[PDB]
Every structure is written in C-alpha cells, then in structure tokens.
Amino acid sequence: MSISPETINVAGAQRMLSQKMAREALQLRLGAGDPKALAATIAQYERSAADLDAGNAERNVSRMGAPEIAAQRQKVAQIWGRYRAMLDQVAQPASQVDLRGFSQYSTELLGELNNLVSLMSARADS
Amino acid sequence: MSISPETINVAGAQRMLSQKMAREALQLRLGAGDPKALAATIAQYERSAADLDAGNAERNVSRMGAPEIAAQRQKVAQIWGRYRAMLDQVAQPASQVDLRGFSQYSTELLGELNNLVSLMSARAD
Ligand code: NA
Ligand code: NA
Ligand code: NA
C-alpha cells in the first residue's frame, strides 16, 4: 500500500457513520434520541471528510490527489450536503418529511462512499 | 500486508452493517421501511462473519488465526446474537421496546466490531 492503512480505515468508517447518523436521527424522530449524539456523529463524518480532502499528518490520513478520487470526493460532498439537511429535518418529531426519500438517499450516499473506498483501494493496492 | 485488502474491507463493513440494520429497523418502526432490506443486511453481516471466521477464497477474505483476533470474533458473536434478536422487536411498530437500550447495544456492538478491525490491522500491517 502507498497510502497508510489509517487512510483507508477513515474512508471506510464514513460508510458506517452515514448509517449511524440515520439511526440517531430516526430515534430522535421517535422521541427517544439524543441530539448531542447525532451532532457528534455528523462531526466525526465531517472531520474525516476534511482530512481526506486535505490530508492530516497528525491523524496519518494521506491526501490522495488522483483526479478520479478527488472527483468522487466532490460527488460525495454534494450528496452529503443534501443528506445532512434531511437528517436535521428527520430528527425533528413535528416536521414534514418523506421517510422513503430519506432512506433512498441514505442508501445512495452509502453507495457513493463505498465507491470512494473502492477507488482509493484500487490506487493504493498492488 | 499479509492479508488481502478485501479482508480489512469486509471487517470494516461489518461496522457499517451493524448500523444499517438499526437504521432499517427504526424505519420499519416508523412504518416507512422494507422488511426485505433488513433481512438482506442481516444476511450480509452473517455471510461476512462466516467469511472472517473461516476465510473465503472466492471472495478473497483471508483467515486470521491469531488468538486475540479469534477471541475478539467470539466476543463479537455473543453480542451479535443478542443484537439480532433486538432488531425484530424494534422493527414492530406496535411493540414495547426500550429504544435507549437498543441504541446503547448498537453502539456496543459497533465498538467491538471496531476493536476487531483494529486488531486485524495491527496484525496485518
Ligand atoms: Na439519537
Ligand atoms: Na482461522
Ligand atoms: Na462467529
């Protein structure tokens, strides 16, 4: 591997975080949740996204400048912005939302994050 | 690396699957879910757990026999068995369930899956 294992770990964990935040938001919709937990999960995702975009030497996350990888990070980022806004709405018990649309979007983001991991691994691995 | 990168990918994805299942079960609790999706996610976790325990040549998942890794897979399996049962309760809109208990247990399983990934990576480089 040309990148650190931690780089691939952080990218893979984005997949998990996307799902964790959805569960936390749905639990908030049910009135049994914790806004602090949701915020913290979203913050972990965003911290990792910035680390993957810029590199983070302290955290041992490599910036991968390959154009296809950078393009996939940007594709992910556009989906993420819309998903993040949906999370905020889902988490409010009294809001109007489309829960099937939310689920579809969670699955879409997950797929694009998995695609990011795949591209990173292809470039990194022998 | 002594193990295939796919081995680490599959172990990491178990973290994700544990959380996807919770998302799906809560969607079902809210009447906006899909039982087939939850079933598929559970099945994927179970196949991957089997692959990590035994190896799977077709899928390029390597065996890792180090005692600490085997012990952690066993620890995960005990938590998983209990978690899996909780899912069915959560997913029923009309059940009485303790959702905070469920989320705590989801986070516990996630942590042990993360610990498994860490142990695997340490051994693999
Ligand atoms: Na919550
Ligand atoms: Na083994
Ligand atoms: Na097992």
Numbering used by the authors:
A (entry chain A): 14 to 139
B (entry chain B): 14 to 138
Question: Any passages from the paper?
Answer:
Here we show that Pseudomonas aeruginosa PAO1 mediates nitrate chemotaxis on the basis of specific nitrate sensing by the periplasmic PilJ domain of the PA2788/McpN chemoreceptor. In contrast to the NarX and NarQ sensor kinases, McpN bound nitrate specifically and showed no affinity for other ligands such as nitrite. Following the demonstration that PA2788 specifically binds nitrate, this chemoreceptor was named McpN.
McpN-LBD in complex with nitrate was crystallized in a buffer at pH 7.5, and its structure was resolved by X-ray crystallography to a resolution of 1.3 Å. The McpN-LBD monomer is composed of 4 α-helices that pack into a 4-helix bundle. A single molecule of nitrate is bound to a site with a positive surface charge at the dimer interface. Taken together, the data indicate that McpN-LBD was present in a monomer-dimer equilibrium and that nitrate binding stabilized the dimeric state. In contrast, a single molecule of nitrate binds to a single site located at the dimer symmetry axis of McpN-LBD.
